[PDB]
Every structure is written in C-alpha cells, then in structure tokens.
Amino acid sequence: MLEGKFEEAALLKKVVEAIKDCVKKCNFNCSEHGITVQAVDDSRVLLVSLLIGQTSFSEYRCDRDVTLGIDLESFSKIIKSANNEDFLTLLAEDSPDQIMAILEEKQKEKISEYSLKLMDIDSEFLQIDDMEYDAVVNMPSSDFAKLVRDLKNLSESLRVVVTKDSVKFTSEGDSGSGSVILKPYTNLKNERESVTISLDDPVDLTFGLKYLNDIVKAATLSDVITIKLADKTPALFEFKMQSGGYLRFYLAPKF
Amino acid sequence: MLEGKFEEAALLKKVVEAIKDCVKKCNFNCSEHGITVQAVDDSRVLLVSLLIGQTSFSEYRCDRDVTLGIDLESFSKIIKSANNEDFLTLLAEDSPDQIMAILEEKQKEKISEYSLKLMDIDSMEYDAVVNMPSSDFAKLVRDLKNLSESLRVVVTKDSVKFTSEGDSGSGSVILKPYSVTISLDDPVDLTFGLKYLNDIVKAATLSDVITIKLADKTPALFEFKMQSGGYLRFYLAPKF
Amino acid sequence: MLEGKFEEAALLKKVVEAIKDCVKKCNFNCSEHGITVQAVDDSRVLLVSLLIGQTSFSEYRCDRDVTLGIDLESFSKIIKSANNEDFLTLLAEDSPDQIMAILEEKQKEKISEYSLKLMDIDMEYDAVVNMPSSDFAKLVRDLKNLSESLRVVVTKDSVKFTSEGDSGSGSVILKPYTNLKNERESVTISLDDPVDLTFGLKYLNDIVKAATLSDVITIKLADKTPALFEFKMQSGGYLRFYLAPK
C-alpha cells in the first residue's frame, strides 16, 4: 500500500514539471525507502533516475511495495492545480487501479481529491550504476541552465573541457562561436553558489544541447548541479533535493 | 441625452473586460437611474445582466433615455488606454450615432478624447445559495477545466462539491462551512459547461465575493455585487 | 583596431534591442570619436542614426578606423545573454573577419567569449517638443489601436495627437509644464511656426522602443521635412530616428 503526505506540494510539482516533457509515462516504484523512478526518453538517449526519500515526507507508510504506471501529461494537469504550500497526499491501494492525490489548503477549508487511472508499463525499467568518474564539477544550476540556453542559440552541440584550473563550455555554428569559462571560486555568504572542480584526468566531451535543455529544467529542484564526467561513459547531471532525495540524468557523449 | 462622469475609470475598465469575451456587442440602456446591459451569448445559453447605478458616478445626467449599441472589442481598445485613477466621462447625444469617452489624468496635463461609432443592435426564488471568494471559484473553474468540459455542482447543508471527470483523471473540490457559506431549502445537483463558467469567472475583478444561486432546473445565478452600487449577473442553464 | 570596454552591458543591450526590429543588419563604424551606426529601414522611410561616444566607455582604443558589418539578430542572441551589470568588451582586429564580445560577470570567475563573423554591408526646425519618452510611447501604442497614422499638431500652448479609424477616433492633448521635482519629467514646446504633420504609426511603434535609452524624448518637426525623434543617452551619445511625414 501507499500513504505519503508532503508538508508542501512544491517538491512534487517541480518534479513532474522537470521530467514531464522528455518522459511521457513511467513507473513510480514505492517501498519503505521512498518513491523511485527509472525511465528513458523517447529517443532512448536520456536516462532519468529519481528518488524521493522517506525523509522528504512528513508522513510516509508503504508497508508493501507498489508500482504505479502514470501518464505524466495527465498527472501534470492534476498536480499543477496545487498551491506550493498545499498539503499533498499520495494514496494507492495494494494491486492498485489508480493513484489518488489529495490537496489540503493550509488556511482554508478547501480539500481537493483527484484520481488518475494507472497504465501498465508491462516492462519494469531497471537501473543501477554507482560509478567512478574522471572529473566532478559543482556549480549553480541557474548558471548552467543559462549557459545551455544561451549556447543553444549558436549550435546543437556543447563541448565540455575540464582541467584542474577551469571548466570550458563552447558552442560553434555558422553565425559564430561562443565559449563560457568558469574557474573554481567560493561564495562566502552562500556556499551553494560556489564552483568546485575535482579531477583525476582532464576531460573533453561533447553533448547534444537538445538533451541538455531538458536536463536543466530540473534547476528548480536544487541551487546546485553536480556534473560527473568520464571519458567514454554517460555523464551524470545530479540535482540533490535538500529535503532528501535526488533527480539525476545520464547522457552519453557524442562519439 | 447622457453625461456620466466617473471619479475613476477602474470600474468601467473592469466591466468591459469581464464581458467582452462572452458578448461581442451589446446595448447600453441609459436612464434616470443609471446604465443597463442585457445580452445573450451567440449560443443562447448565457444571459449577461449589468447595472451601473447612478450612485457609481460622481456626476450623472440622463434627461431622456438613450440606447448605445457598442462593439465591445472596439470599446475595449479605447477604455484599456485609461489609467485606473483617471477621470472618465461618457457622453452621448439624443439619437446618437457615436459615444464619446473623455479621460483626464489626475497628476498630469493630459486629456484624451475618444469617439466610437455606434451600431444598431436588437434588444426569483432558489433552492440553495452559496457565497465564496470569487478568486477561489475562478481558480477551481480553471483547474477543473483541464479535466473535463463539465462541472458538476452538489450542495448540501454541510458542503459544496465540484466534480469534473475525463480521460486524464477525475477531480473533486469540496468546500465546507466548518471559506464558504451555504443556505438551502433543497439539496442541489446540477452540471454546467465549463466553457461558459470560464467566461463568467472573469468578473472576479469586480468583487471579492461571488454569490451563486441554484435551483432544480432553473438557470443558476452568478452574482458579482459592485460596492459602488450596481452589479454584474450571469444566468446559465444547467444540462439535461 | 577596436577595444572598447563598458562598465556595464546594459547600454549595448538596450541599444541592440531598440533597433534590431527596424534594422536587420548594419555597419558599426568605429573611430576615436566612438561607435556610430547609420541605417535605413527596408521601406526606405526611417533613418536610424546611433552614436556611442567614447565617453560611454570606461576604456576605449580605436587607433585605426574599422567598419563592422553585423547581422543584428545574430548579435542580439549574443548580447541579450549578458547581465546588465556585466563587464562588456567589444574587440575587432585590423581588417577584421569577425567581432568579439567578452562578458565578465561581477563577483564570479565567469568569462564568456563570443565571436560573430562579419558581412559586407553598404537641419532647421519649426517646432521642438520635449516630453517623457514613457508618455510618448504610451500614446503611440494606445492610438495605434485605432488607425495607422498619427496626426501631430503643435502650438505655443499645446501638443495634440489624433488618430482616426473606421471604429472610431481618439485625440491626446498635452500642455507645457515644468516639473519642479524632476525637470526631466517636464513637457516643453518651443516653436517659430505652428506645425501640422501626419506620420505612420507602424514606424512610430518601432521608434518608441528606444524609450529604454532615455527618460526624455526630443521631437523636432518641420513642414514637409523628416521629423527627428532623439533619445540622448546620459552616459554620452544618442539614438536618433528620422521619419518623413505623409
């Protein structure tokens, strides 16, 4: 069974918005640990890995695992109705036919109750990869979102070059080229707006800006984006949720 | 004749915006007691009833009744030009072919004079009454429109329940007095087209409270009282 | 060659945005005087004249004149990515193939470097009105809703803008005044002759986009000659539009 109550709907609204476009449908796997999603986009290039840990809820009971196959388009029309501050409770029975979402307004006598019918993904999507990487970059999600959009105007490729001194993003098309170069630095007031680099080996990889443009919509889930790169390995783009959990994207470079 | 001065253009601006979508043209009926509008949508399903009483004006002279057939989109382009705090005067002569709108800026040396040509247009007891904030009702109408073309409304002594079902899921919004006020003789169970309700809730600009009155197989009333002294009312038939 | 550094990118951003609609491509002529642009619309009705004087730069060297033919849409994609507060440096070498724009973010170790390839590209007045550019922008937009031409009538005591269409007419009348708290919010009229000219609101709608560059618009009118719409940039320089009446 599933009974998960959020203090605030903001988190689940931001999650559904961040993935709904590159992912049309997916399985929400619920267990005592929390709720997870493993999915791939339609072109089978971009891997999405989500974890909403038990700790992100105020009340969470899932005494028996349940899988919920959910159309994210339909679920977004439901969840978008909620105020960020609303209580939000997800309910599903054992062997469920549907998911229920109940919204409760904080300082109002208003309760909204929604029910979405489930789909059978009828192919559990499995995924596991704790990995070793050549280089790891931590930088503000907002700056990385902005350079992706800005450099998409010039071409469909983003070259990424990491050394101990700097990270360099470049994009060249027929109009002209653009490079954005960041060096490690500390923001003393708010360490989350710092840039850090730790590497074994220098890295030089190219990614399709179409997919990076989808990834960076998750910038609403965390101030910080962790980028992990390896020489012939899918790069990790990680958004850690402060309440506990994460949203991750895996994207192969171009070869 | 007609000479009506408003202290502020806000009221007319809100009025024209609230109805211009549901009603593209309509007659303004000026009288010794104020300005009236009775209009029906193209579908002949929605009745719009407007009263701007003479008390809404700082100065109002209408020695003899006059009808002003106005294309609301054209009028909307003129009246949108005004600041909310502008003086606004409406002028029309006997047997008029146009309406005149004079805007005077409070804090500047700016006077604007507009003229729009007229067109010729051709002219109680309820089971339950709900009061709720217009903003809340506007929000649930929009939110549930995403699920269905129909909004079911079910009123009892202890609750009001709005439901909307479709292929992307069902949704129900439940308001309790225990936020909302409810007065009922009979319980009520009516269904309305959300396309029309979506137009009605635009009048939330005129009033923080919406009064909804329903009856078994009667047009429901959606009332927005202007605290200047008029009202904007929408009458909408249920289905079946 | 060109090396001009701005303390803030805001100026160039607003300049590029103000003209990129009326003008698709243009030459940036750089000299020790500064950077200027002279271009005319596709309709051959509107002449755009820009001057970014060297006084608007914190550092400016141009030891030799250079002409930079630039696609403004491409260039806007670049310049709009900058924050207003960013350091902005324009570079070009002698006999250039491209223009370079370097953005430095304040308070960060973040430097963006862009380069776009170049292309080859080729009075006495009766009355002067000064008024807030906001107020002129607003009346243009409001009266564009009723017709495609704006009549302008200037006397010692008033300025009158009218616009008549098949729906209806509308007129806006302004009187001179001095604003004692902020002189820039004044309306001033000084004329030899009264003036009565009509202009296309299609073009005026493009002109008023320059209201981002200055609080004040100066309008200079003469019978049967092009009217001047001037936006003086306080940092030093101007953006001018010349528009023939009908």
Structural description of this entry:
Three copies of one chain form a homotrimer. By secondary structure, chain A is mainly beta. Chain A has one domain. Chain A contains four helices and 18 strands. The first copy, chain A, has helices spanning 10-19, 72-79, 141-152, 209-215, and strands spanning 2-6, 25-30, 34-40, 46-53, 59-61, 66-71, 87-92, 98-104, 110-117, 135-140, 157-162, 167-172, 176-182, 196-199, 203-208, 224-230, 233-240, 245-251. In chain A, strands 6-2-3-4-18-17-16-10-14 form a nine-stranded antiparallel β-sheet. A five-stranded antiparallel β-sheet of chain A has the order 5-1-7-8-9, covered by helices on one side. In chain A, a hairpin with a 5-residue loop joins strand 8 and strand 9 (110-117). In chain A, helix 3 packs antiparallel against helix 4 (209-215). The first copy, chain A, starts with a strand and ends with a strand. The relative contact order of chain A is 0.18. Chains in contact: A-B, A-C, B-C. Chains A and B meet through helix 2 and strand 9 of A and helix 3 and strand 13 of B. The PDB classes it as dna binding protein. Keywords: DNA polymerase processivity factor activity, DNA replication, DNA repair, cell cycle control, DNA binding protein.
Write a brief caption for the model:
The structure is a homotrimer. In chain A, strand 2 and strand 3 (34-40) form a beta hairpin.
Give short descriptive properties of this protein.
homotrimer; 255 residues; mainly beta; 9-stranded antiparallel β-sheet; 5-stranded antiparallel β-sheet; 18 strands; 15% helix
